[PDB]
């Protein structure tokens, strides 16, 4: 929603729109495994004026590559004015969540299993038992290839995104079907109306 509306012809800047691009930063960095770069056909003065207004935010984007608690703490204290400006309590540990996103995602394609005590040592993780705790909520996140070995302390990856083998696959694709269907439907409808253009 943000990006599709922010390429709109923009010449008036708003701290409202500042909260907009800030929260967009929040998602696009936290929500992603790394940074997004956008279709840069947004405002002339606005998109390029708030862009230095996004000084701390580009640097914090770099921070997404950094993995340092103290600096992000300091910047959070800086922007706490925005952190709670609309009862948006929790944005900082949203950032921390993106942090452990990076942690776990790195860990993802590394290996099959480690000394997960030693891995918690590895990944700046705050608690080995705790480590499996958020691992297992990733299991509530339903994504992880991990597993619960109290005895051997073993967490493996299991590499089953899909085995291309489903009526479920059929459902994914039928979704694709009807979606693209109506997509092309309004393509043809809007084309149709382009036919309605006057003497030209």
């Amino acid at each position: 929603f943000y990006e599709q509306a922010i390429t709109t012809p923009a010449m008036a800047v708003s701290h409202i729109m500042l909260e907009s691009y800030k929260k967009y930063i929040l998602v696009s960095l936290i929500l992603l495994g790394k940074v997004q770069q956008l279709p840069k056909y947004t405002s002339q003065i606005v998109g390029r004026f708030i862009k230095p207004l996004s000084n701390a935010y580009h640097e914090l984007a770099q921070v997404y590559s950094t993995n340092n608690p103290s600096e992000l703490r300091n910047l959070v204290n800086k922007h706490s004015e925005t952190f709670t400006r609309d009862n948006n309590m929790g944005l900082v540990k949203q950032c921390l969540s993106s942090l452990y996103k990076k942690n776990i995602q790195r860990l993802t394609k590394t290996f099959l299993t480690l000394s997960l005590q030693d891995m918690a040592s590895r990944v700046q993780l705050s608690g080995p038992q705790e480590a499996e705790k958020y691992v297992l909520h990733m299991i509530e996140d339903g994504e992880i290839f991990a597993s619960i070995n109290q005895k051997d302390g073993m967490v493996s990856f299991h590499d089953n995104p899909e085995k291309y083998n489903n009526p479920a696959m059929l459902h994914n694709i039928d979704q694709e079907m009807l979606k693209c269907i109506e997509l092309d439907e309004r393509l043809k409808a809007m084309d149709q109306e382009i036919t309605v253009n006057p003497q030209f």
Partner: protein
């Protein structure tokens, strides 16, 4: 072009035979430079260098060198110099008046008013600029020299003299353009075939130039393309490269650049380089059993000549690049056939600690090509996976989702545009 550079020092030189090898400006240049990160062997390097300032006498560099001399001498005096500086100043005035001698000569020869007289004027002008170690206006003559060359031998003259300049001029872009020229541009096949399969290949000098280019230019592909092209029958240039450095330099630019097949062709079926081949038995069997993969002692002498490539002025500036891609391609070499990377004996080979081993590997993870994972308790990888079809599936769906995303985006974009929509400035 000095990199700070730490030590730092390697005792693995013999400078007497280096000055036997190299000469001129570059001689004392590397003398200085090596001495810098080679203290106390700094000593004799700089001693013989300054005596080379007693050789055609650039005594400005004498000033610099005895400056360093007394500096490190007093610094020495913790441990435990005496020099004929005044007579040096006398001979200095001698040199300067000889400068004036040849200047008067120069202007005489200006007055001669002969295009070939003009050309030899350029020649000898740059000559004495070389002589007393101050070089500037020399270039002008050679900067002027091209305006006096028309014929094929005139092309020969312009090219070889501009680049013989560049021996200590040492400037790529224009002079590399003229390497390209003098090999190709004038009188295609050069009207001389570069000496018709050039007996003494100044092509070799062209090669050295472009090789240092893609040293700095770092496009080492054509670098090694020329490095293989070593043609012994040029047979002489003390400023060209020491055949030790010649072969090591070239072949290791290659050993960075290559893919194994044509390079073994370049190496095992190297013929033109075979003398250059047979120069360093060290680096020869180094790369031999490297491709044969005795990684342990290969890497051993690798980072043993660490210090001596450092001892190269020109191997120093890319030691990290080299050793980087070296151990990279060491990986690339052995790892490719396997399916599950066991480490134990293999680590016994590479001589990296189990953690350091696997963190090398972790690095590898950062870029690596195999869909591979490790039971650390295996102390062993399993390498890349199997399917690419389903991979295509997932990329397909990612495709489609962002497609529909863009599609709605552009629907709404048609709205915002055709709904007049924008943002005013205030």
């Amino acid at each position: 072009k000095v990199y700070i550079e730490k030590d730092v020092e390697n005792p693995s030189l013999d400078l007497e035979q280096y000055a036997a090898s190299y000469s001129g400006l570059m001689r004392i240049e590397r003398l200085q430079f090596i001495a810098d990160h080679c203290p106390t062997l700094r000593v004799e390097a700089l001693k013989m260098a300054l005596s080379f300032v007693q050789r055609t006498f650039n005594v400005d560099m004498y000033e610099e060198i005895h400056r360093k001399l007394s500096e490190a001498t007093r610094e020495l005096q913790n441990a435990p110099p005496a020099l004929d500086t005044a007579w040096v100043e006398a001979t200095r005035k001698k040199a300067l008046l000889k400068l004036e001698k040849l200047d008067t000569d120069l202007k005489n020869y200006k007055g001669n008013s002969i295009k070939e007289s003009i050309r030899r004027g350029h020649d000898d002008l740059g000559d004495h600029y070389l002589d007393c170690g101050d070089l500037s206006n020399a270039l002008k003559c050679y900067s002027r020299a091209r305006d006096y060359c028309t014929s094929a031998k005139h092309v020969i003259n312009m090219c070889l003299n501009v680049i013989k300049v560049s021996v200590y001029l040492q400037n790529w872009s224009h002079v590399l353009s003229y390497v390209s020229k003098a090999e190709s541009t004038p009188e295609i096949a050069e009207q001389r075939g570069e000496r018709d399969s050039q007996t003494q290949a100044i092509l070799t000098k062209l090669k050295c130039a472009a090789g240092l280019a893609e040293l700095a230019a770092r496009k080492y592909k054509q670098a090694a393309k020329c490095l293989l092209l070593a043609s012994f029958d040029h047979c002489d240039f003390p400023e060209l490269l020491s055949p030790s450095n010649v072969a090591i330099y070239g072949g290791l630019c290659a050993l960075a650049t290559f893919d194994r097949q044509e390079l073994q062709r370049n190496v095992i079926s190297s013929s033109s380089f075979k003398l250059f081949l047979e120069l360093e038995p060290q680096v020869r069997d180094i790369i031999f059993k490297f491709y044969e993969s005795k990684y342990a002692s290969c890497l051993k002498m690798l980072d043993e000549m660490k210090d001596n490539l450092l001892l190269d002025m020109y191997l120093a500036p890319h030691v990290r690049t080299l050793y980087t891609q070296i151990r990279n391609r060491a990986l690339i070499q052995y790892f490719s056939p396997y399916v599950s990377a066991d480490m134990h004996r293999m680590a016994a080979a590479f001589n990296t600690t189990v953690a350091a081993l696997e963190d090398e590997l972790t690095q590898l993870i950062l870029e690596g090509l195999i869909s591979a994972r490790v039971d650390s308790h295996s102390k062993i990888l399993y390498a890349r996976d199997v399917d690419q079809r389903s991979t295509t599936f997932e990329k397909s769906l990612l495709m489609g989702k962002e497609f529909q995303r863009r599609a709605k985006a552009m629907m709404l974009r048609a709205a915002v545009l055709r709904n007049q929509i924008h943002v005013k400035s205030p």
